[PDB]
Design a protein around this nucleic acid. Structure first.
Ligand SMILES: Nc1ncnc2c1ncn2[C@@H]1O[C@H](COP(=O)(O)OP(=O)(O)OP(=O)(O)O)[C@@H](O)[C@H]1O
Ligand SMILES: Nc1ncnc2c1ncn2[C@@H]1O[C@H](COP(=O)(O)OP(=O)(O)OP(=O)(O)O)[C@@H](O)[C@H]1O
Ligand SMILES: Nc1ncnc2c1ncn2[C@@H]1O[C@H](COP(=O)(O)OP(=O)(O)OP(=O)(O)O)[C@@H](O)[C@H]1O
Ligand SMILES: [Mg+2]
Ligand SMILES: [Mg+2]
Ligand SMILES: [Mg+2]
Lengths: 432, 605, 362, 99, 52
DNA sequence: CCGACTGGCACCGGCAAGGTCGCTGTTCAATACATG
DNA sequence: CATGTATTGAACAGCGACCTTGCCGGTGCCAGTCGG
């Protein structure tokens, strides 16, 4: 007895999403490796990580995830997850001796727990464990939904999770760490749609506003608000593909999202009669595009966001087929529908334990507005918002939940054993 | 429900013998009464450890260093002094580097001294302010020399002007020319151990204007600082100071085989008010590029007193383009005493030519950016300038303009008072062209910030210098902004005022220290070699402070030396003597870069 | 009482010395040589190359051959430092985001092979920040083998924001061989390569304006500096001087698809929390031997100022000791009184196993 | 076949409820506190380390005094050197250019 | 600087005496899921320290 | 499994206290220099 | 030959400012006991 050292199980936790994918070992406060889900393609050769996206003749930017936050390109999913879990998180194999210029299966150690979107269909869950068990020799596997992990990253066994992702905004009720299935509600009104709103709004100011991405400017000089920019742009021996330009512009839309846009936080919706006229008078926020193009932003700063809270406010899409958001896909409608899918007796407990998640929740004023909206749509009940996370960095809430889950000693009884998979084939549906 | 039915079905909850959790539990550090062992002992500081190892080894060798293997370098805007510490006198070369280039230095810029050619009146041609100041100074001298009861013929200036206007060049060739003078044959290969056809020193000045491949000259130092005005980029400047010193080792010292240099040691003399970036550049050349075994730094005024053998002195260094003053006591330049004025013996030459031009100097086409004109101007300055207010009269002389590949033209000319007023610019510096000295002064190389707090400037600062800046421009902003605002002002003051403001800050309010320093003035640097400079400066100091007029005493050079060489001689003594542990070794610098200068020098760097 | 030891496990050069010292005692190539048909380490292995296979045990900043790495530490302690680890605690540096298994394995070796009493493993970037004078900043560490950018806030290195430019001082040496072979010289041999690495260390610099230098190099004489081989023949190199370092700024120039050091610095900053970025732009810190090229700071200042918002003060902290900052930070850390309640004791290892490093070193 | 059992459902739920209420909440608290302590430790440590790295450059009275002594030692030796070249014997290297 | 008592606890207590630390090895551990199925994780082990 | 009530521990600002460190000061044997 | 001195280079003793954590009064959130 007592022959063993200080260690249990070095699990690693994997968490794919439309904008980003996150991986690392359980029992750390942040994922080791976070990469753009968007992956480079050049000439039958796939490239990964934000350090390996750059202008090249063949360059095209793909994504292995679709806007349902599910995998659509499992070959590329395999290559991406292998870049994270094998090349970046295991010991390198040494160079052959002659090639060093002086002379002249990989996951058997670490079980894999993987994060799935709430609505992820059984066929995609089946293929996840099937891919895992063939490609890396992993000893055991588990699959769990973002809302469940996000709740654990706030420390809550029972919670309402509002999850304002990139491709999707979601609401779900978590109770004793299970998802209450009827409560799952989902919406395109999220960080991707919000970028489209911002694009639309730029293409409709008095002088049109043109975004030009960071890679196309060689040098820039400072200029006064609304002036033509002192700049010189690049030229290349090739056409830049539209997919590439779209991906490199999303950086600037992310910068505008984080440093300018602000949720309307005052009493009532932004379109109640006094509110817009008030907003137009206030001191705004400044911004700079990579071109040097400098401006102060006053009233639009609210409107670009407001559409997810009242669809009436939304700008029309620049893609004419990207249909306008319905009343039912606004955040208060999601919330009210989600909670109405739950037992009446449980509703106060959930509302007392609100967990917010996802990078779109980092809009200035998002917790303010959500507190107001919850108060006014459920009067006579206490409200308390919590961020998912252990830190200021509320970006990683789903991942951190996994990190915590796989570190609990009680959890290790749960995994789908390699030996269970190779005896049953589709354990993944029923052992959940 | 169910209980043992679960076990019979093979289903059983299980801790797996694991802990309740595997999340790290971290114990908080306690730092009450913390202590540090870092750099606490000489044993631990590499710069001192290596010196202790050298001391121990020297004691062992004594129980049982070579001046011929120490090089001493003293840079300068017109002249570089270099030699071995063994040597009686250093070899002096013009610190100029010539290379092949598209355009010669005369083609790139307006002619000097600056003039508005084809201007609407001669008062505009030379600038109205300047002409009024010259007229003032002429009248001021006439009143002064009448007070001294010298002879003054009323027509003096007219006799000069009319003669210089009406006279025309004689032309001479063959044995009628007193010198069969040469030009540098830039086609011929370097025999001094190297491939590149580049020229330094007197030979570079003697490159003909219309050489078959065109050569441009470059000076890496001007006004006593790195000459960032001329150079396109930092790298090009560093590469030229490296290339010049490299060729000076090869062509003056005859250390032609580069591989032998690793056994030599080097003493480099730097100004009292140094830019740190210039000190650290010179270190880096001496170790990464030349691989010398040891480097040590001594300050110009410190070295000057080592050249004299003085415990305590006020040292006035009057260079070509920098004049600097500081007071030395008890083995240091007094930190706050340092004053650094952007003028010197070159300004006297420009001004001398400009005053004679304005009068009627025959060769009106002259341009001091053109080499043979530059050498002409400098030779005339050395012959005819004098601050002695005596033997002054309408005098007739002549010079030869041996232009390249063009016949020798001889000009007769006269002078009267331009010969004294141009030097006297040291007592009203507005008469000099100071308009472009500050041009490009931070164009390439930034001001020296502190290694860690990179906003805070770390160049030297001296109360005496700030007093001079306040005289030019009356003087919450950050320390960076303050230093920028100071750098925007060119330090200029009359030489007497600069000395007394130096000495008052040296004493820090003590008439007895003043009475020692004022009676201890030592003058060095080539600009000082204008005849009677020291007595004239003693007069100017006496008449500004009558309370000191019995103690004030100025002396030229020390111990029979030429003003130029004293500082070099001193730096050699600092090479030779045994107590000097100031050396940065090559291994230190490879390990810790310029950080080890702070550990090693004999003042707070 | 006797000091702890600090060892910097470099891909190119290993460095070792006593804590408290301001510079290493021992600096020697991380080369192990074994017979083709005993073993030798460092300069000996290079000297006797004719009878040896040589391998580096560290590749791209990470240990890859433990049986060889153990010989380097043996050489470090017994030949170079001349002290027995059985009487000294030891601080080891390691590369950012090295694999957990490597932390465990180097824990195993300095206890089980060297009987060291107490020991600590440390992230190289963080140490270089301590040596650079500050608690928060972003460290571009660029060695022989790898280049990392590491944001650090209140002395905690953010793992997620680390970006690794897989290209460094050896690649720039291979590249300088390539472009000199194009100019006309021959440098294929290993005994020639070790000349070219010295050429790189002396003659190269980073251009402030690369296009303008290329445009003027066609005519300038000043640029073409010359270098004597040990062989006695003299080479001359020209635009090669800056084209070798320029590959840091344009890795296309040597044929890979990663963004340069400047864009990777910017991307690391942009992966951080908005509130932190003000401080990181105010505290860019350079570390490791590849950051030593004259004027690398001026060009990093220019390039990042071009990428950043015009409001941000951008500041590049390049200490004169930056070649050894990783070691110097270790020196400092291992010589605070605080270190004693921060290391792994052998008494802890003896009941926790190598996995103690995941608790104790953070 | 395998997992439709009421017994399976009970154990699965019971594991998850205890894991959610007890263990996730304990580990949440511990992880948050542990993070806070780790961050504090590293902050404290970095503050000391960064001070030490700079400390050698700070002026001190003792450092100033010894530096003044090093200058004065060298200065006296320089006087000694000239005494050994003007008083012990008059040993000046008189020289001329002989042009 | 270095002294007796607290503040030097570790620098007094460290072993400094050459004696072997217990030898670790990459062993394995039988892990049992709640469905009764058993699987193996690589885990560190060392031989038992002796009886008092 | 669940809520009302209770005794308890976490956290706040605050004052008392510790040793290390830098600034301040006395005393010693050995030194270069002077008169003698 | 060898009397005679202030200073040197250093070890040793003294004092207050300094940074940090312990103990403290108090406000607050919490795990646990109890009844159901
Ligand atoms: N500070 C910010 N403020 C607002 N939005 C942000 C911010 N940072 C990132 N975003 C946006 O939020 C998304 C970031 O990814 P996030 O984790 O929030 O979703 P995801 O998990 O990648 O995608 P999904 O869950 O929809 O599959 C992107 O659309 C990004 O542009
Ligand atoms: N024989 C001489 N008589 C008078 N003046 C002379 C004589 N020789 C040179 N000068 C002048 O003295 C000036 C100072 O020469 P010096 O060699 O001291 O310049 P420098 O030391 O380089 O100046 P800086 O160090 O400030 O650049 C020369 O520039 C020249 O104008
Ligand atoms: N002065 C210099 N100029 C240019 N390059 C230099 C200079 N000094 C060293 N190098 C280069 O830097 C590299 C060594 O740096 P360093 O010791 O930091 O690498 P390392 O730490 O062993 O590498 P790594 O951090 O990748 O493990 C070599 O390629 C060397 O040639
Ligand atoms: Mg997501
Ligand atoms: Mg001079
Ligand atoms: Mg390194």
């Amino acid at each position: 007895a007592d022959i063993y050292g200080g260690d249990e199980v070095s699990a690693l936790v994997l968490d794919p999403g439309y904008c980003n994918t996150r991986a690392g070992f359980a029992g750390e406060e942040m994922p080791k490796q976070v990469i753009p889900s968007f992956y480079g393609h050049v000439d039958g050769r796939d490239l990964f990580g934000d350090e390996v996206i750059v202008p090249r003749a063949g360059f095209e930017v793909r994504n292995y995830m679709n806007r349902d936050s599910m995998v659509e390109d499992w070959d590329a999913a395999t290559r991406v997850w292998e870049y994270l879990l094998v090349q970046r998180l295991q010991p390198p194999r040494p160079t052959p001796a002659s090639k060093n210029g002086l002379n002249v299966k990989p996951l058997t150690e670490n079980p894999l727990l993987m994060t799935e979107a709430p609505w992820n269909t059984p066929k995609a869950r089946e293929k996840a464990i099937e891919v895992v068990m063939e490609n890396w020799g992993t000893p055991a596997f588990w699959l769990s939904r973002t809302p469940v992990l996000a709740a654990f990253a706030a420390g809550k066994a029972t919670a309402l999770v509002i999850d304002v992702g990139g491709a999707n905004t979601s609401v779900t009720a978590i109770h004793d760490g299970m998802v209450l299935k009827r409560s799952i509600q989902r919406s395109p009104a999220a960080g991707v749609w919000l970028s489209g709103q911002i694009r639309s709004m730029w293409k409709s100011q008095d002088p049109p506003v043109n975004v030009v991405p960071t890679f196309m400017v060689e040098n820039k000089k400072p200029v006064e608000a609304g002036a033509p920019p002192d700049c010189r742009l690049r030229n290349f021996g090739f056409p830049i593909h539209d997919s590439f330009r779209a991906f490199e512009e999303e950086r600037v839309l992310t910068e505008f999202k984080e440093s300018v846009v602000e949720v309307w936080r005052g009493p009532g919706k932004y379109l109640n009669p006094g509110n817009e006229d008030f907003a137009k008078t206030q001191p705004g926020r400044v911004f700079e595009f990579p071109d040097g193009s400098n401006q102060m932003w006053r009233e639009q700063r609210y409107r670009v966001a407001e559409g997810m809270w009242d669809e009436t406010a939304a700008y029309p899409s620049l893609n004419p087929d990207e249909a306008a958001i319905t009343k039912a896909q606004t955040i208060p409608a999601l919330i009210k529908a989600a909670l109405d899918g739950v037992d009446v007796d449980l509703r106060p407990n959930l509302l007392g334990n609100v967990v917010v998640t996802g990078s779109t929740s980092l809009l200035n004023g998002f917790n303010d507005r959500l507190n107001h909206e919850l108060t006014n749509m459920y009067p006579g009940l206490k409200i308390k918002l919590h961020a998912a996370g252990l830190t200021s960095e509320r970006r990683f809430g789903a991942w951190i939940g996994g990190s915590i889950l796989a570190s609990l000693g009680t959890f290790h009884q749960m995994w789908i054993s390699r030996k269970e998979y190779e005896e049953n084939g589709a354990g993944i549906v029923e052992k959940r | 429900v169910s209980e043992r039915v679960l076990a019979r079905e093979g289903l059983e909850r299980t801790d797996n013998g694991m802990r309740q959790t595997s999340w790290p539990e971290v114990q908080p550090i306690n730092q009450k009464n913390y202590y540090t062992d870092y750099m606490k002992r000489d044993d631990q500081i590499l710069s001192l450890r290596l010196q202790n190892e050298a001391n121990r080894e020297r004691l062992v060798k004594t129980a049982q260093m070579d001046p011929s293997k120490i090089i001493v370098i003293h840079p300068g805007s017109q002249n570089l002094r270099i030699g071995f510490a063994s040597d009686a006198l250093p070899k002096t070369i013009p610190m100029v580097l010539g290379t092949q280039y598209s355009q010669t230095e005369s083609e790139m810029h307006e002619a000097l001294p600056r003039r508005q050619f084809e201007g609407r009146t001669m008062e505009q041609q030379y600038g109205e302010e300047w002409v009024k100041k010259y007229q003032k100074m002429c009248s001021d001298l006439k009143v002064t020399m009448r007070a001294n009861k010298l002879k003054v013929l009323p027509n003096s200036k007219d006799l000069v002007v009319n003669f210089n206007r009406r006279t025309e060049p004689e032309i001479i060739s063959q044995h009628n020319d007193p010198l069969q003078v040469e030009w540098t044959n830039v086609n011929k290969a370097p025999e001094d151990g190297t491939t590149q056809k580049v020229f330094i020193g007197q030979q570079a000045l003697r490159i003909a204007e219309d050489s078959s491949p065109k050569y441009k000259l470059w000076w890496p130092i001007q006004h006593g600082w790195l000459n960032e005005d001329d150079y396109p980029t930092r790298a090009h400047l560093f590469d030229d100071l490296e290339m010049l010193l490299d060729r000076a080792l090869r062509r003056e010292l005859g250390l032609t085989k580069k591989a032998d240099w690793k056994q030599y040691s080097c003493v480099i003399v730097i100004p009292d008010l140094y830019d740190k970036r210039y000190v650290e550049l010179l270190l880096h050349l001496c170790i990464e590029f030349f691989d010398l075994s040891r480097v040590a730094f001594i300050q110009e005024s410190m070295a000057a007193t080592f050249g004299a053998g003085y415990t305590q002195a006020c040292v006035v260094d009057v260079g070509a383009q920098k004049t600097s003053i500081s007071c030395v006591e008890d083995g240091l330049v007094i930190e706050d005493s340092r004053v650094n004025l952007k003028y010197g013996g070159y300004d006297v030459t420009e001004t001398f030519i400009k005053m004679m031009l304005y009068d009627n100097f025959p060769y009106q086409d002259i341009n001091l950016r053109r080499r043979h004109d530059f050498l002409l101007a400098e030779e005339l300055k050395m012959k005819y300038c004098t601050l002695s207010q005596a033997n002054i009269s309408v005098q007739a002389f002549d010079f030869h303009l041996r232009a390249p590949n063009q016949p020798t033209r001889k000009y007769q000319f006269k002078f009267y008072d331009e010969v004294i007023l141009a030097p006297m610019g040291f007592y009203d510096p507005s008469i000099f062209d100071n308009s472009t000295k500050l041009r490009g002064r931070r164009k390439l190389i930034d001001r020296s910030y502190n290694a860690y707090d990179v906003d805070m400037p770390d160049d030297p600062t001296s109360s005496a210098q700030l007093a001079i800046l306040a005289m030019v421009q009356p003087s919450q902003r950050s320390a960076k902004e303050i230093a920028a605002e100071r750098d925007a002002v060119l330090p200029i003051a009359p030489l007497d005022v600069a000395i007394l403001t130096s000495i008052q800050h040296a004493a820090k309010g003590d008439e007895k220290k003043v009475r020692e320093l004022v009676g201890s003035i030592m003058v060095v640097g080539g600009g000082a070699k204008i005849p009677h400079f020291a007595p004239f400066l003693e007069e100017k100091l006496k008449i500004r402070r009558p309370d000191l007029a019995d103690r004030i005493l100025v002396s030229r050079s020390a111990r029979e030396m030429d003003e130029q060489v004293v500082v070099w001689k001193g730096a050699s003594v600092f090479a030779k003597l045994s107590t000097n542990d100031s050396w940065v070794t090559n291994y230190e610098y490879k390990m810790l870069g310029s950080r080890c200068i702070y550990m090693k020098l004999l003042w707070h760097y | 009482e006797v000091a702890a030891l600090v060892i910097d496990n470099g891909s190119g050069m290993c460095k070792a010395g006593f804590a408290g010292d301001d510079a290493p005692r021992a600096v020697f190539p991380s080369i192990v040589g074994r017979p083709r048909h005993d073993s030798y380490v460092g300069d000996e292995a290079q000297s006797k190359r004719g009878i040896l296979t040589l391998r580096y045990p560290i590749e791209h900043g990470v240990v890859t051959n433990w049986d060889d790495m153990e010989k380097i530490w043996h050489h470090t302690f017994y030949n170079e430092l001349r002290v027995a680890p059985e009487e000294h605690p030891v601080l080891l540096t390691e590369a950012p985001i090295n694999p957990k298994s490597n932390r465990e394995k180097m824990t195993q070796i300095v206890f089980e092979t060297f009987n060291a009493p107490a020991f600590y493993v440390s992230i190289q970037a963080v140490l270089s920040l301590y040596a650079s004078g500050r608690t928060t900043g972003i460290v571009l560490d660029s060695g022989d083998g790898v280049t990392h950018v590491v944001p650090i806030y209140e002395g905690f290195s953010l793992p997620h924001a680390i970006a690794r430019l897989d290209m460094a001082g050896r690649d720039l040496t291979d590249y300088l061989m390539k472009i000199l072979a194009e100019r006309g010289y021959t440098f294929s041999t290993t005994a020639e390569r070790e000349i070219v690495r010295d050429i790189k260390e002396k003659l190269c610099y980073v251009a402030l304006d690369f296009e303008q230098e290329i445009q003027t190099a066609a005519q300038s004489s000043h640029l073409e500096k010359s270098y004597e081989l040990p062989d006695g023949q003299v080479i001359t190199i020209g635009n090669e001087r800056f084209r070798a370092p320029e590959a840091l700024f344009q890795p296309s120039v040597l044929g890979l698809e990663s963004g340069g050091i400047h864009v990777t610095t910017f991307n690391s900053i942009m992966k951080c929390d908005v509130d932190v970025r003000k401080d990181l732009y105010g505290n860019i810190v350079m570390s490791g031997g590849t950051t030593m090229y004259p004027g690398l700071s001026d060009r990093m200042q220019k390039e990042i100022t071009a990428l950043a918002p015009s409001s941000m003060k951008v500041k590049i902290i390049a200490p004169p000791e930056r070649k050894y900052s990783v070691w110097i930070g270790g020196s400092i850390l291992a010589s605070l009184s605080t270190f004693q309640q921060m290391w792994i004791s052998k008494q802890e290892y003896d009941e926790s196993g190598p996995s103690i490093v995941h608790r104790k070193c953070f | 076949l395998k997992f439709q059992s009421k017994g399976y459902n009970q154990i699965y739920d019971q594991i998850w409820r205890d894991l959610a209420r007890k263990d996730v909440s304990k580990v949440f608290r511990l992880a948050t506190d542990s993070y806070a302590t780790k961050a504090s430790n590293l902050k404290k440590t970095a503050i000391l380390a960064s001070k030490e790295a700079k400390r050698w450059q700070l002026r001190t009275n003792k450092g100033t005094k010894d530096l003044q002594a090093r200058a004065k030692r060298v200065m006296r030796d320089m006087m000694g050197f000239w005494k050994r070249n003007e008083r012990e014997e008059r040993d000046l290297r008189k020289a001329a250019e002989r042009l | 600087k270095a002294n007796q008592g607290a503040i030097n606890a570790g620098l007094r207590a460290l072993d400094r005496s050459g004696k072997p630390c217990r030898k670790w090895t990459r062993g394995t551990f039988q892990m049992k899921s709640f469905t009764g199925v058993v699987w193996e994780i690589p885990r560190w082990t060392a031989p038992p320290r002796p009886k008092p």
